[PDB]
């Protein structure tokens, strides 16, 4: 039930639904992680019984992107110690491998 509440919470976060009877979502995602989401979304719509595969359009806007760091079980403590003072911007050098 706590999963199903979360999916219905982020569908409230999803499309205005004025455009069609379908949902549009502008999500951020890693560029090098893009084969894994498309392989999951292709078989994710198969469970619903739909013959129409959902598609993924790439945008070229100018909104500021968030940061992301590959986080292990070891380097998580050294990451949030650096992250406590200030979040890093897009593609600044993370001092956490040096920390």
């Amino acid at each position: 039930v706590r999963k199903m509440k979360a999916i219905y919470h982020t569908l409230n976060l999803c499309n205005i639904d004025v455009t069609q009877k379908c949902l549009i979502a502008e999500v951020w995602c890693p560029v090098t992680d893009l084969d894994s989401i498309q392989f999951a979304l292709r078989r994710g719509t198969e469970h619903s019984g739909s013959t129409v595969p959902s598609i993924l359009n790439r945008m070229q806007t100018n909104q500021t992107p968030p940061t992301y760091n590959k986080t292990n079980k070891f380097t998580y403590g050294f990451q949030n110690i650096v992250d406590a003072y200030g979040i890093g911007t897009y593609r600044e050098i993370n001092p956490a491998p040096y920390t």
Binding site: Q20, K21, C22, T51, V52, P53, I55, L56, N57
Partner: protein, 54 residues
Amino acid sequence: SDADVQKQIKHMMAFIEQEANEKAEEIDAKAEEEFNIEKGRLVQTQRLKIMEYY
């Protein structure tokens, strides 16, 4: 893959004919109550006027 803009016009326009035909053929099939059984209201009314001459 540049085929996404083709895949967009592929099956999302196939959703249009799902709304186009199958919703209008629903309304086109709503004639048995709006034409056929409303035919039976007045032809039973003027069936009295056959009998009053009869």
